[PDB]
Amino acid sequence: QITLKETGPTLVKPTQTLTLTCTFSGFSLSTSGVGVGWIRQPPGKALEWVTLIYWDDDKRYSPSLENRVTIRKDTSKNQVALTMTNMDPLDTGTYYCAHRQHISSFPWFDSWGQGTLVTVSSASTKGPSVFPLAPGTAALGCLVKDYFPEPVTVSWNSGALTSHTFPAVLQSSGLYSLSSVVTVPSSSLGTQTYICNVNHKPSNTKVDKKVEPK
Amino acid sequence: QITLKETGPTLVKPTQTLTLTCTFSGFSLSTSGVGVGWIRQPPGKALEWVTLIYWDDDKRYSPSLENRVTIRKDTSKNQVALTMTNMDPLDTGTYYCAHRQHISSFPWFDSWGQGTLVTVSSASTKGPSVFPLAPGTAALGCLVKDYFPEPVTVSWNSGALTSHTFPAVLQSSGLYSLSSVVTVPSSSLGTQTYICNVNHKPSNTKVDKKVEPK
Amino acid sequence: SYVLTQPPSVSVAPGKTARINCGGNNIEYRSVHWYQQKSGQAPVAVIYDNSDRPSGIPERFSGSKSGNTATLTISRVEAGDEADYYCQVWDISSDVVFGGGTKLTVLGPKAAPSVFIFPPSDEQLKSGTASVVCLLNNFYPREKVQWKVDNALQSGNSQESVTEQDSKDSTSLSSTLTLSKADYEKHKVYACEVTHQGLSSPVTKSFNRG
Amino acid sequence: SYVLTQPPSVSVAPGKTARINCGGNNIEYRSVHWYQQKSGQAPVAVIYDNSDRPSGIPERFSGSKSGNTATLTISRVEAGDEADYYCQVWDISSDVVFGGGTKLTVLGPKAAPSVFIFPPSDEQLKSGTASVVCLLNNFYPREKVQWKVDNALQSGNSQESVTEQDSKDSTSLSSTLTLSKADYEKHKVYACEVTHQGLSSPVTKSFNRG
Amino acid sequence: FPIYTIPDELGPWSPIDIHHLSCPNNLVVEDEGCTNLSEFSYMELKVGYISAIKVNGFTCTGVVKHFRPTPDACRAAYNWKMAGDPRYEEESLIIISPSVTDLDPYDKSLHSRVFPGGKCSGITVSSTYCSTNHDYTIWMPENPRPRTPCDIFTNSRGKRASNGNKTCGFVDERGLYKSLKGACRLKLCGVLGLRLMDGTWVAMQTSDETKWCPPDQLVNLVKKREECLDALESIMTTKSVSFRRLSHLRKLVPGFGKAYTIFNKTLMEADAHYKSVRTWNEIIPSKGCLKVGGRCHPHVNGVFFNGIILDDHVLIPEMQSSLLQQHMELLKSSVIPLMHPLADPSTVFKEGDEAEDFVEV
Amino acid sequence: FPIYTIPDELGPWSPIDIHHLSCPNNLVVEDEGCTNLSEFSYMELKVGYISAIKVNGFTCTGVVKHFRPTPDACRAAYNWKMAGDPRYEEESLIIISPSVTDLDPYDKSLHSRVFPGGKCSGITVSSTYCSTNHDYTIWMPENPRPRTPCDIFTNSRGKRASNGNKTCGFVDERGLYKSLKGACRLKLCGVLGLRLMDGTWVAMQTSDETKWCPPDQLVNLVKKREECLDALESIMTTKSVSFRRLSHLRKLVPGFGKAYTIFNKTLMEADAHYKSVRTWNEIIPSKGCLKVGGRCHPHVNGVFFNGIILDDHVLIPEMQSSLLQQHMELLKSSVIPLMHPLADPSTVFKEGDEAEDFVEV
Ligand SMILES: *[C@@H]1O[C@H](CO)[C@@H](O)[C@H](O)[C@H]1NC(C)=O
Ligand SMILES: *[C@@H]1O[C@H](CO)[C@@H](O)[C@H](O)[C@H]1NC(C)=O
């Protein structure tokens, strides 16, 4: 049926301009009753409508957000653009792009792109620092701290190891850190050596780290 | 005045043929009373006459040696050749080439080339093994053992060291060994490091060795 | 600003019917919309215009309204329709306003967590910033991690990450302490307290500097 | 074979006259020749035809004969005309025969040797052939080095090298023992005995395996 | 001793475990006065059959919780596991490949630690399955009916050496003197050859009588022999191996020998003819290139054989532990730097016209 | 911390001994919000005068066995020793060059450990010879009449940074941010410049008032500061240095610093502006080539500066002690290699239909 594709800069610096583009197939932005919205949801927080534009270049705006957002239509391309000025870090979130149902009088979104992940942070791309988290089973892990451009790929013994990589929380310094951990036979400790393979493609910092008990 | 120059193979294998060439300026092998001899002296042992040839291609021979030596004249080149068959190791020695005084009735050599050092040994060219000889003065040294083609150049701390390298004695295995030793301040031991630079050009085996007390 | 309320965290009996209220000024005259958002997914509309269902939403979901408080009732609850449920309406204030979500929780089985602690590496005690780590795994329900640095409570200074429901079990998390290398060299007792339902006693694994 | 005798090692009083005899059959009728050979140099003729001197040999050297025993006398001896002195004659047997040399020794001052010993390297006790070294220096006269391996005499098994008269002093040598690595691991007392004129007592520096 | 020994020719790899390992034979024999050399042709065991004649099989066991399994129904599931289509569904027979076993020259029995007594008499038309230590577990071969391999030799041309009318050693096509001293007769494919050194199996055309090999030995700085056995004992206690302790099992002198390596947590061995290496450069000439058999050797996820691994840089365990000791040493070398006399804090001056000890005249 | 710091520009070498040595200043200061950058030109101390203003002299002493010597007759023999013709004959005056002494910006006194109090007021027309710790030993300069050097500067062009109307740091012609934080005024040649960091002496055209440098400091992983002081104490007990303990005295961060080396048993130092090295390759690209100042650096008998020496291969003390620990480590990595179940000597089988622990389903 209908499909909507958000595109844009995954990452934008605070006080810069963000500009995203929903591209959409199933329907007609040139009809007399449809509209294309943006709803954004900061991670773990509740949905927040951001803007809507209708077939007659009427541009609805969330009141909280009106002074920064700028919405635009082109229905020759089947594209809507969303343009937010003076990016603030709280604006980090997923930006969904949605289709407003056109028969129904009060507005509601039936179609919703799997939305894009906008992250507004001020950090130069910096590689990770990868520290070891040493140990009828025991457990060991890697601590990848202070990586900035997420994501980080932690492999274990060359991904030859099969059994919990964690998500990243934004630190007090606008940098990210995530930690990967494995359960091995308690007997292999001090006999089978364990090395985690960490790659921060952003800075193409590749580092492997040997993790053993004291 | 007269000058005589031995030339030939410094080294010959036992049971091979040795052939040496005395070349000589001051005098006339084409006169009617002169002759050109060979006297050889094994190292540290007494002189031993070997052959003599006179202006009339008369070839005197030492009786002990006649069955192997072969002497020859060419006075067109001012050269005499000495040719010894079936080289035996005892024949190692210096081969002097001398001029027989031509007025004097009983034969005696007035002129004598600084003679050549014939060494008849069966060993393939093999580099040295350089061992350390560790320690109001104390003394330390290098032991260069089992070098075959003599000579060996022992330098000390890059010949930056200034104060007894020894000659080589033929071992029980037809190989040579020589040892170089230095007197340093007894206080420098364990503070100034001492390295001997040994080069066996024959096998271009260069080896430097650190010599310190235990 | 306009606002319409819906409770956080309703809790249901699996296989029973559930009921979430959305209430806001003059809902009797606007029409109210209802969205299910499963974890990490984009929202899907479950009912619209008060009581209508999309072409593929099961009859179990329903919605109806009385007065200025509308409500979607999920009859015969399964465990997969456990999600954030948002309601939404038009106002004068904005065109579309969303109730802050309601987390339906379906329940019923109680697990327990294994507690490993990880001191800061000698690599990180050479940076000046140590970091202590407390990893729990396999617990369910999901909800309390304290830090005893020289037996003394440490609050306001850690962060926490987690993974979600495991593909098989449904039970995980990572606690992280930040001292300075002088705060590490000056306290000896280093512990991690833990509180959960299957736990009959508050768990703590401790370590000293050596 | 023909042979003519001359003594090894005549010894002179420096500044006195010296006399070496060469004697062989019928020397009264052949004529006899005399050669000085300084260390490492090729021989130089000093007198020929019994009593004649080369153009540059000093009148000090002379030679004369009586009966079948000829002799060169070096009057007013210096220390530099200290050398091997060969005599030489024609025979029927060969054209030229040399007396085995006579070593003139000029004397008079007595030194003493310093004795360092050097065990075999751990590099050489890994080959299986150890080697022990005894280095003496600065002695004069030049002439006896024994080896005490577990206090027991060791003969027939060492070799020896030396340098010559030093440019300044005139005084040096290297003794070398060859055991096998089982003969090294099985004896403890490892010594070097030394005998010289300035020595009032026979010197020995000993070492054990450690 | 050469600085290193590298293979010149390396057979196929075979899976083995830590028990199959064993220190190398490093023996070398000169032949003295063996210098009449005559050009000649002869045969030789093809690399990969020299150490032994492997013969692959598999392990079929039974479950449903154990039952003794049936061969054709096991054989059935070998073929399945070959594609794993109706295999992983599964009354269940569980199959493990490959079970390398060795072929006994004398009784054509198969050896393997799996077998009771470590032997099987053999598989034949009527005996289709060997029995193992485990009751509900059998062994069958890759083949339905295995056949003694007889295409196992190479043709070769060396020069042979004879001190007298009798001959003593030869120089193989790779140039290395092999002495017939110590060799016994060994009957391969109805040919009577000499096992020479490390199993070197040659067959001449000229036949002199010689002692035979006993039916017991028939399958598979002397300090270094004990430096190595320590590594093996070090391995077996831990039941764990390291590339460092791997590089000790290398034949230290040129001639036949096994080479070892490890792929994807799987230990492997292979036949190899070692060549002495005069300088580290001749085997490592490039950044990631290991010259062996005149080309650059392929690596499996950065692992070459004999502990040699791969920063994108070929590191040799014996090479690395040298440069580190070589370099480290020069870096620790010392000096007394010159100091001016008058430049010292504490230089006591002796009063009077007594001239100090500046001996520069 | 960068992986290494290499000079970009290296002044002349000066003879010094072990006392002149001293750990490096590794301090680094960022300047925050200092981002208005404006193009600008300025002056700078020519490398080789930055750390100090050396002024060479010599040591004339007296003998015949001591006597206090006379200057012109000493000066006489300096000129002789210059050729050593009527020199080595020798009533005798013995001369030692070169006596480096340092020029004091404030009182134009000369410093050197040779001098009583470690100072000389100076040489002038009437004072032609400094006196030393030793009574019968004097000091005179290479010059008859030395002159304060005033051709000591370079012209340079950087970009300067100002957080606000006031400016805070600049980026020198070699690209490195230098912060004016911590700098004091210092009067060179009648110009009032800033000593910046490690003595960095720049003179701007724009003048803001700033605190002066005191007449005492006027001449010449904080763990690493103590890692280094150990090396210095290690050196001074022994009165001996090693290339290993030499490479600790290297400035670990980019900016001004002294570099040390040793030639022919003679210790030497020189001014240097360090550049951070991101990868070992960018400084060692060839077999014996050390890229510094964009060319390959000359060595003196295999010795480059800062412990870097020369197998025909450039080895870096800090590089070498890394690869050895890096490589050695991979080589010691371990594994448990797979073993077949039935392949064990001691595998107890539990009798009965009890299925063993092969968990492969
Ligand atoms: C064997 O290696 C391959 C790479 O070629 C890898 O993908 C695979 O997972 C490995 N096998 C196992 C069982 O891990
Ligand atoms: C200084 O080095 C040179 C080599 O250029 C060397 O020949 C000289 O002997 C050295 N100086 C001293 C005093 O050894």
Side-chain angles (χ1 to χ4, degrees), chain A residues 191-193 210, chain F residues 329 334-336:
Chain A
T191 72
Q192 152 90 347
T193 65
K210 208 157 178 285
Chain F
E329 198 49 39
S334 173
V335 47
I336 282 181

Side-chain angles (χ1 to χ4, degrees), chain F residues 84-122:
Chain F
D85 16 0
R87 175 69 169 59
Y88 277 77
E89 286 59 24
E90 340 300 344
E91 287 282 316
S92 307
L93 301 177
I94 176 160
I95 299 204
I96 316 141
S97 177
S99 182
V100 147
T101 85
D102 287 6
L103 182 66
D104 199 342
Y106 170 67
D107 51 4
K108 296 185 188 59
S109 63
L110 302 190
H111 303 188
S112 157
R113 267 193 300 270
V114 187
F115 296 144
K119 252 195 201 185
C120 193
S121 61

Side-chain angles (χ1 to χ4, degrees), chain D residues 1-204:
Chain D
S1 35
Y2 193 64
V3 69
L4 72 184
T5 61
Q6 48 180 149
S9 302
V10 78
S11 302
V12 83
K16 198 33 193 69
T17 72
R19 288 162 302 181
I20 287 157
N21 293 337
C22 181
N25 309 77
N26 302 332
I27 277 175
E28 196 203 335
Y29 307 87
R30 301 134 166 72
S31 62
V32 190
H33 304 301
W34 280 110
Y35 296 105
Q36 141 179 280
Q37 185 194 216
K38 282 169 196 161
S39 211
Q41 203 154 319
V44 164
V46 283
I47 77 164
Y48 68 101
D49 277 354
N50 296 352
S51 316
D52 293 346
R53 277 182 295 118
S55 179
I57 279 51
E59 58 171 356
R60 323 187 286 108
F61 300 95
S62 67
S64 60
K65 185 198 297 186
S66 172
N68 296 5
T69 70
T71 168
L72 81 176
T73 85
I74 313 180
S75 60
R76 47 192 288 185
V77 194
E78 310 190 359
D81 46 16
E82 176 185 10
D84 298 16
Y85 286 75
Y86 291 77
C87 68
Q88 175 259 309
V89 291
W90 164 89
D91 180 76
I92 291 187
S93 160
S94 149
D95 252 42
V96 52
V97 310
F98 292 105
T102 293
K103 170 69 175 73
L104 204 170
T105 36
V106 196
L107 59 85
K110 179 176 68 179
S114 48
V115 170
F116 296 78
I117 197 181
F118 300 112
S121 53
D122 282 12
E123 283 97 341
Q124 213 173 187
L125 289 161
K126 263 187 301 295
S127 49
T129 286
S131 295
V132 200
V133 186
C134 205
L135 155 64
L136 297 72
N137 203 14
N138 302 359
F139 57 63
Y140 162 60
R142 310 320 294 296
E143 322 173 8
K144 216 61 193 293
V145 169
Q146 256 290 331
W147 288 97
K148 253 181 265 288
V149 169
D150 250 349
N151 285 117
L153 173 149
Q154 316 284 330
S155 297
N157 50 13
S158 76
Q159 305 178 181
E160 291 171 6
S161 180
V162 197
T163 58
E164 187 72 11
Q165 299 314 117
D166 290 0
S167 46
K168 305 137 301 182
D169 54 62
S170 301
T171 61
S172 304
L173 81 89
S174 35
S175 188
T176 323
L177 199 69
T178 318
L179 297 111
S180 89
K181 194 219 180 201
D183 310 338
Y184 187 89
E185 305 167 299
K186 88 152 54 67
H187 307 128
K188 279 312 204 298
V189 170
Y190 278 108
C192 172
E193 186 145 335
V194 161
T195 315
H196 190 263
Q197 250 73 52
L199 292 190
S200 61
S201 61
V203 174
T204 292

Side-chain angles (χ1 to χ4, degrees), chain E residues 119-160:
Chain E
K119 252 195 201 185
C120 193
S121 61
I123 167 179
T124 73
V125 193
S126 68
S127 189
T128 47
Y129 77 111
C130 282
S131 208
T132 86
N133 286 342
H134 180 270
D135 263 8
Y136 323 88
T137 285
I138 71 186
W139 182 99
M140 306 174 56
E142 208 170 0
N143 246 12
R145 180 219 172 184
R147 193 83 157 89
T148 304
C150 260
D151 189 6
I152 70 198
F153 318 98
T154 198
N155 298 157
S156 288
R157 305 184 187 181
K159 328 182 105 199
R160 66 143 88 224

